[PDB]
Amino acid sequence: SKQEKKESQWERLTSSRAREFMTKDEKTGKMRDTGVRFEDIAGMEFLVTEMREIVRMLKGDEAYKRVGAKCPKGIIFQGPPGTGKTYLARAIAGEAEVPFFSSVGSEFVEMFAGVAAARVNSLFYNARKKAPAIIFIDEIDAIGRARSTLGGDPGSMERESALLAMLVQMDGIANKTEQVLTIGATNLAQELDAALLRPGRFEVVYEVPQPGPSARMAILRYHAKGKPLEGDGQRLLLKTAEATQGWSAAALANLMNEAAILTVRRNVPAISLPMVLELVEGLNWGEQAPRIPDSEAKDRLALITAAKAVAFALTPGLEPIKSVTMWSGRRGLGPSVDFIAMEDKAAMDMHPEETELMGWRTNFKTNAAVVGDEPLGEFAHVAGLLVPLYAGRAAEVALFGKDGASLATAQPLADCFEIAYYCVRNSQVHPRFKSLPPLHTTMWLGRDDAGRWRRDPLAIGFDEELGYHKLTLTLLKASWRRALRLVAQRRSAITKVAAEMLAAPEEKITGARLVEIIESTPLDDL
Amino acid sequence: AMGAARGAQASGDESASIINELLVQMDGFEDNRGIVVLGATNRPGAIDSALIRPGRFDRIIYMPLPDALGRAKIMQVHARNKAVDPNINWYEVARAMAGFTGADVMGLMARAARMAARQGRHAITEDDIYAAMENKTMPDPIPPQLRRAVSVYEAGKALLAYITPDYEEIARVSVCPLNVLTGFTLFVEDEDKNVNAILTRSELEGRMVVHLAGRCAEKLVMGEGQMTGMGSPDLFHANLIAREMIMSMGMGRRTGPIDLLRVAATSEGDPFYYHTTDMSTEQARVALAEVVELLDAAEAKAMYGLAINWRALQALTQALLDRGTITGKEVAHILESNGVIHFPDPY
Amino acid sequence: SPFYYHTTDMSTEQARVALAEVVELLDAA
Amino acid sequence: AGFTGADVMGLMARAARMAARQGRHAITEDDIYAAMENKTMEATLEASTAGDGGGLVGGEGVEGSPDPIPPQLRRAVSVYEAGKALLAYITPDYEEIARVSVCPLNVLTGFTLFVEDEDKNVNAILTRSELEGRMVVHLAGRCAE
Amino acid sequence: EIIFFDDIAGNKQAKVELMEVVDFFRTPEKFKASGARAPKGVLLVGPPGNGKTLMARAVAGESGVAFISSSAAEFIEMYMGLGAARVRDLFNTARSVAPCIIFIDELDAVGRQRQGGGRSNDERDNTVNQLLTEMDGFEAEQQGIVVMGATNRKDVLDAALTRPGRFDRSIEVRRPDFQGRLEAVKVHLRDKPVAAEIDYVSLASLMGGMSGAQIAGVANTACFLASRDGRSEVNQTDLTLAVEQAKYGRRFVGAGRKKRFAVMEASIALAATLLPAIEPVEYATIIPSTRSPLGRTVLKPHVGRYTTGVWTYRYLREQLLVALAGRAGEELVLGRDELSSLNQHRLQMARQVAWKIMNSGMSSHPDYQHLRGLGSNYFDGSSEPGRFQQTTVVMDANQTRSEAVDADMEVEGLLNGGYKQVFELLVRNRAALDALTELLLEREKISGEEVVQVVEELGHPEDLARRAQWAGYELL
Amino acid sequence: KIITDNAQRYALVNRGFAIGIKLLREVFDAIALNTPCIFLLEDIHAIGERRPNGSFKEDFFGSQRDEVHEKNQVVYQLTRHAITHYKKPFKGDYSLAIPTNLYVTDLFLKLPTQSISNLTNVENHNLSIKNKIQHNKNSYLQLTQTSPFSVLLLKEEKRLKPNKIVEELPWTSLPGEQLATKPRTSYSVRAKVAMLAELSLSNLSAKLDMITDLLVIIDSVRSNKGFVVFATTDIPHVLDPALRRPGRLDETI
Amino acid sequence: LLSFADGNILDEPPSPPFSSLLIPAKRFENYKRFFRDTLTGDKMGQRKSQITLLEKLQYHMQLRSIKQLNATFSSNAALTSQKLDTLMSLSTNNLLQNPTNINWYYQNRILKRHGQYLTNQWWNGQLSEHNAETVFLSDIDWRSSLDVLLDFPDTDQYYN
Amino acid sequence: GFAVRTALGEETNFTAADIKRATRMAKKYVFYYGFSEAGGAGITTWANQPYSGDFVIGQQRARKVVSTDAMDAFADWPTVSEDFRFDAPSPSDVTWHRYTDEVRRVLKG
Ligand SMILES: [Mg+2]
């Protein structure tokens, strides 16, 4: 009426508002169940195994205390957002058949002071009264955040009080007879306080990784139960699982959902893998850009892309070419020359490091260039990279003269001096410098704590007298002449590759057809 | 928790009051005959100024990380509780616990008990201790001539590191392990070494020769035109040694006792760097002549050391071509069964 | 606030002349 | 020149101390000049001598500072200060000399105190003749040594 | 009042993706046989002023269910722990009146990524945390309620919010297209008096690039100018002036500073018209705008180069001439001692062109000609998805100390020989230059056909021959 | 009897409000009640550092918010003061405007500085260009020596390091989601520089001039009688000349 | 006490501690990139920046995992993981023998670069305003004609 | 300054304040505005454009606008956006020689 006015306001202000699960609420005959058990979780077999052994050890084991095995009464889940930690918490609540207090780390600190510590007290009291139980403080990032060095904030004050109340309350389990288990879930685990991670409060922390290929296929197989699929769903699932690298489980669920929605949006019975691939592209990048309108400039862009591709395909030592595109469907980007990825080599049984070993094999052929019974040597191998970089500019300067050179072909050519500088100076395999005493003419002697490098003090005039610049320029001049002759001899195949990629359905050519075009056409007359 | 410095989350009346009353009880009207306040902390810089003044808290004692037999002892004293291991070697179990603390040992044995219970057993055995790592973990692809080159390199380096007096012990010599394009000769790191010991001239020269050994083996077996740049870090280290003898230790007869280089440790990427001195062209050319002399002499000695052991070099490179990974024990055995000739030690 | 007080970006051939003039002032003094 | 009221009262206090140091009670004007010199030399040796460095005091007994300042090192300081004062005297329209001294605060340098007029070039003017005369006076000490 | 989908202009794709939501909301039958749940989050991204609140109200209307609108600025409060209280009460009322649609404006100003930062990061962060446990949270759901948010950039918000499961669909609101403007010009005058002599395709192609709010503004302005004129409605001619002053804005310029403008724009026009590799002129004006303090000549955009990037070398030489034509004509007409500071930025532009020619492997130095740039190129992303910015590093390890001298000497030869060439050009064509500047002074703005006619009837014969030789070529 | 206290316990400022700087005058006027006494006060530079001309503003930004006459007067007086106030009492003192004071400082404190080098790719000495924004043994052979692991290793993993170079994106960026697993300042130069600049500006903005009331309370203690005050320091040259003037703190020891 | 301004840019303005301008630092960052890529490397001893042992091991692990997935769900394992993490422990030994550096160029100058093609290269100087800096800051936009998009590039930076 | 020198017959530090100002202007004559004859016309391969004062950590005074030094800065148009700033490569110390020699010719005339 008068003062328990304010005190009732207080004990309503400071009562635990955590939702209690798995106990029967006597209001209407109901009891809040989650509706998820340990079979709705895909691709986390390690974590489900740990959780299963813990929920057996906590529920009348007599087989773990048979061996003195106590339960770690502080558990933390951490990992990037979208990995399904709250779903694991829901499944644990379901299969634990004990009281489960769900709460968040963002409800304690509020209007007045002393409210957060009192709410934590109320929660832990009604928990310890009903032992054994489980508590789940989701997003502890707002409560167990590290104590800063300054900042005069009453919210900071309430955070400090809530934090130390939390600390002493999980210290309130000093008599081990209390069997309360507490779980935290976060993705900013680095910003937690070091006192929490101390043994006796939060002993175990768990990481949830982004799913690998097997876990991805498992999640897809699960979320696809109850939807129409075209053909054998196993191949479709294999492809869409090894095509969405780096995705989270929420992303895959949403992917299947919107695939079904689009399947019934345009009146098609089943889902075919082209549609799901289109979906993953549109979800990675966004809207699809339109092609380039026809011009007398699209013809020259086609020609320079064709010369670049035909020179990539005759460079001995490069990985297989997969396609040559003229569209690319992105904004800012233009034509492209693509190479086989990890998936295709995995399907082909090739070494991961094969571009390195192609420097020493002796009798083979990769796209349209053959090497026979004598290897390259990381000099010829790397210095052969300079012809595909001078091929656009060579096509221009050969068909039009200097007046027809463009900015379209200047960024490749502006990256050749670095490669030739490595071949001459840093690689240490230049035919000229092999016969010298073992002196190291390119030494830098480390960085300091301000981050500055220093040079070998003996090196007065080494780069001027060893003649590095003139040697790099000899390499580049020879490369330019090589590319000129190459573009002059493969004139017809360049013309034909350009013509064929211009008149293609998706404006794409495949590597095998490119290779065949280069092979069938005879050489020109110079 | 209480002894925090000033300007913290307070208005100088709550925290300051409690630590000032701590003071008044510690110093003001001292009658603490037999009383001792034994605080526990690991952030000893955060304690207030007036709280560590002479008299209040001066004795401050440090404890180090648990180590091999220390954590062995923490296991043993912890091993009086359960249906423990009756008697099994765990003194070398601590070798598999590098970088662990007491809390790590407690949590590890806890999880080991948990998995021993998961095994349906009632008692815990030794291997399930290793079973901690059970949970927290969760033709030829190479062409011939590359295999040959790397084998010859590693054979040359290991052979010359074997026949050189006072050099370390070979632990592992492997060529392209697990079909990963690489190779190395590993040496046994010893703690009997005391870095404050100085290095004589003969020891430094021996290290220079060992570093040039592998490149000289390549040049002698396969020809100059087939040398790769694979032996570049060895060349870098040989050049470091030859520039520090001349410009840090005054072992050049034409420069003299002048100091021009100074190693220095980083505030902890590499562990170290150097302080230099801007030289004229004369000083620098006179130092360069000496460095070149040292290096080409070391190269000649490495070439002779390999040439008078051609049969053991052949045996070692063939063993590497056939097995791809050998231990130090077998290196010794292969080298002795083929007539290896050690270098003389004049001292 | 090595330590330098003055900086100058003049060419090298003008630096020659200016320093020669400083030197001859000091010689006369 | 450039003093104010607080300056002159603190000056009177330091002058009384300087007069004590010579066994007198009445403040003389020589004690005021000595107070000026003392303040100046203390200011310069506080800026030179700092966390370590140093190497300028001469009466501390430590390995740095010899105790009696050997005589060959006193002849030199006297020659230095004599050459500087002699050149500042024979230079037409230089400042006027108030007090020449050697070894103030035991440091190994001299100190010549110059009275100058604030109303010939009102804190702002520098002519060429004056700058050349200053150069000559500043080289005179080294040249005489 | 209540809004429906037929009140918005443009955004046909957005209308389809929102009719998806309404079809799942009111009549969920197709999606029983589909086997698919409904989406919980819809993020509207796009610039402000295109109706990101009106479309939310329209989807709430065609869905025929409640609509509790709120902005994130209401969740911005510097007290301790009331942001989460507001989120909680909003979501509890929404759960009580389910089904619902919860629209939150100003999302970009609260849901930015969490960081250490200042002390606001103690509470502003906490607020967002509450959100992250309402749209997904525990309890596994409330109903499946739809939540939508108005933000301008999706990349500013943190990964926890915009992830799937909390915002499943992300739709975009761009500026009105040609069709969007075509129908928004008429839909904004249905409730406005207007005459019969109007062709909406003319204004649809005449004001491309403005936002919908700006179309409303230009309609408002035309109506108000009619009011101030005494008539009630407007014909074409005056709303065209209204839109053109909404673009270039509406200051006094003296009569001596005006002839400088005239002379320089006339010289630029004469150059761009007489050099065969440069696009034809579009219009020339001497009236300064609110942002550019002098006149402007505009060229007709060549779509070829702009889409592919094939900018040849001939074009870069001519563009150097055109960058220096302004100063050339100023000094030719007004004598040398009247060179002004109105060509500071055209001199910086000519320096840009001349250094790009060298950095692109187009020099005539044999050590540089078809081989090298200037140094080492590094790219770095600008403030957009597909934008990159280039950077060259030149050190002693790629330039030899006497190639630096050569680079300077060559660039300076380009700059100054180009000045001389364009100067002698403008000398040979004095009559056309003066005719153009008189015409510009008397009309204050002219179109490209007038310039072409003047130059064709007055220019030098050799220049007209050189111009007509390369007349038809598509790309040069 | 003796009273001792430290000055760092009174350099507490927040919101630009220095709380302790009147706590100090309160303890002073309490010392004034327990005569006769000695009052110690150590590390006074904590509350006695220099309260902060520039030509970089009219060179690059062009402000020139000053009449030409006042600038000319400043130039006249600056030249005359640099050249003629060398070693003049009370006109020529701990003054950074005189270059010969800095010469003496670097002559006695520092060690011999060397000339430039004859190398290339270095600045003038054997060093590199230095950062734009400021955030015993003989050889190298003697220099080559669940919750905590994960949490604190990834805590050391994500902190901003100024001496890390910067990564480069593939011109066709990482697809959506993956770009959000990466700390932005690790692959973007704009972002890294923005963060460093904000750090530097914030840490500079903590000036909070407190010299004036410290000065007036120092002048306050000569109206009392029968006690003494010792103020101990370690770097007396970095103290502002406002204190070293006669009547405040000049008797040195 | 007189410095003659040898290796640096001629007129450079101050930086955030003094002037709140961020251009010199943005260019210093690319200078440091060049130093690491061309002159020194990441550690003492390396020829240039290199593909680390960790990255090689990770390529191996990814290929192995994709292969095991494609083989198990479309139908000598633990020893591999054991000895593979054995090698992972080395990694910091500077003296590992790496014979070739072609993969660095193939992965950093071909797959991250001139495999693709950036199409926004240049522009004609005559826009609707007197600048690109004014056109970019304008209130509506000026990059829309079919209504194609006509973009202008950002300015190129030189640091020598 | 030249008037004081021609009255007294002797140099002073008054010149010291003159030439400073003039030098700034003379450089702006040669580099930024392009009035000289440095190259055959007055177009130079490098100039230093001003930044806006908005970048400085600034203050505000109650003064009037300066007669010449700040009313001639009405003709400058500084740079306001950071990702559109152009600085050409710095000259080569054999080109800087000739450019600063043009500055000297202006001042001497
Ligand atoms: Mg969650």
Side-chain angles (χ1 to χ4, degrees), chain G residues 17-60:
Chain G
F18 292 73
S19 100
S20 154
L21 176 97
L22 281 199
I23 272 182
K26 278 176 209 169
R27 297 184 202 182
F28 189 71
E29 297 300 320
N30 293 272
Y31 166 87
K32 287 206 312 190
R33 277 168 164 174
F34 167 98
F35 243 81
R36 199 198 65 129
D37 294 15
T38 289
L39 290 169
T40 91
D42 290 281
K43 290 161 164 42
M44 287 158 81
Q46 310 177 359
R47 274 131 94 205
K48 70 177 321 303
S49 316
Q50 295 184 165
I51 298 307
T52 330
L53 193 77
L54 272 182
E55 304 174 26
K56 300 165 149 192
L57 287 175
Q58 277 167 13
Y59 302 160
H60 261 266

Side-chain angles (χ1 to χ4, degrees), chain D residues 10 21 26 35 49 57 66 71 85 88 100 103 113-114 121-122 129-130 133-134:
Chain D
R21 266 176 215 184
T49 295
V57 69
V100 193
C103 296
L113 173 73
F114 282 114
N121 40 16
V122 285
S129 71
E130 145 171 17
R134 296 195 106 86

Side-chain angles (χ1 to χ4, degrees), chain A residues 86 138, chain E residues 132 136 163 166:
Chain A
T86 317
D138 198 1
Chain E
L132 306 188
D136 200 351
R163 81 155 217 254
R166 284 170 175 149

Side-chain angles (χ1 to χ4, degrees), chain E residues 7-127:
Chain E
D7 310 26
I8 307 116
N11 48 248
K12 299 330 164 184
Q13 327 300 68
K15 284 195 189 200
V16 174
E17 315 296 348
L18 286 163
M19 287 193 172
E20 187 25 71
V21 174
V22 315
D23 285 358
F24 221 126
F25 218 47
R26 51 174 166 192
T27 78
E29 292 72 22
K30 303 87 67 185
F31 308 120
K32 325 161 304 183
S34 95
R37 309 174 52 259
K40 317 187 229 182
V42 169
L43 242 199
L44 332 178
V45 282
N50 295 3
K52 276 204 292 281
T53 67
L54 197 124
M55 231 183 297
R57 276 202 223 146
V59 69
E62 314 223 332
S63 49
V65 201
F67 171 75
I68 318 156
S69 101
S70 203
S71 157
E74 254 276 21
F75 306 128
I76 316 309
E77 41 220 90
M78 318 324 133
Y79 294 137
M80 63 175 139
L82 307 165
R86 297 194 197 184
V87 185
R88 271 199 235 76
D89 60 53
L90 181 66
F91 264 79
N92 253 23
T93 68
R95 290 159 185 170
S96 96
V97 307
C100 212
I101 279 180
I102 329 186
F103 165 80
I104 161 159
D105 175 86
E106 284 306 353
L107 183 52
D108 44 15
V110 67
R112 38 210 303 111
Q113 183 131 80
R114 293 173 267 140
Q115 243 301 319
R119 202 44 149 194
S120 152
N121 290 187
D122 220 36
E123 196 82 48
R124 197 273 280 173
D125 284 40
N126 160 52
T127 297

Side-chain angles (χ1 to χ4, degrees), chain F residues 191-235:
Chain F
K192 183 189 182 187
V193 179
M195 154 152 285
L196 280 170
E198 100 192 359
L199 253 170
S200 159
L201 281 154
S202 100
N203 295 357
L204 172 121
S205 206
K207 183 39 210 75
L208 193 265
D209 198 315
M210 75 217 88
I211 310 299
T212 324
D213 54 336
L214 175 121
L215 203 146
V216 63
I217 68 175
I218 271 193
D219 267 348
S220 163
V221 302
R222 64 181 186 263
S223 49
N224 317 267
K225 274 184 182 300
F227 72 91
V228 86
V229 187
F230 292 87
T232 77
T233 180
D234 190 1
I235 25 211

Side-chain angles (χ1 to χ4, degrees), chain F residues 106-140:
Chain F
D106 112 305
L107 167 90
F108 278 101
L109 294 196
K110 301 304 159 300
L111 281 156
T113 313
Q114 32 203 346
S115 325
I116 68 167
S117 71
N118 300 300
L119 293 150
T120 69
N121 286 283
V122 306
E123 218 189 341
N124 12 243
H125 303 270
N126 206 175
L127 271 169
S128 268
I129 294 181
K130 88 165 179 161
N131 302 66
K132 259 55 204 300
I133 301 145
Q134 313 298 331
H135 173 53
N136 330 87
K137 302 183 177 190
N138 225 333
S139 36
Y140 81 105

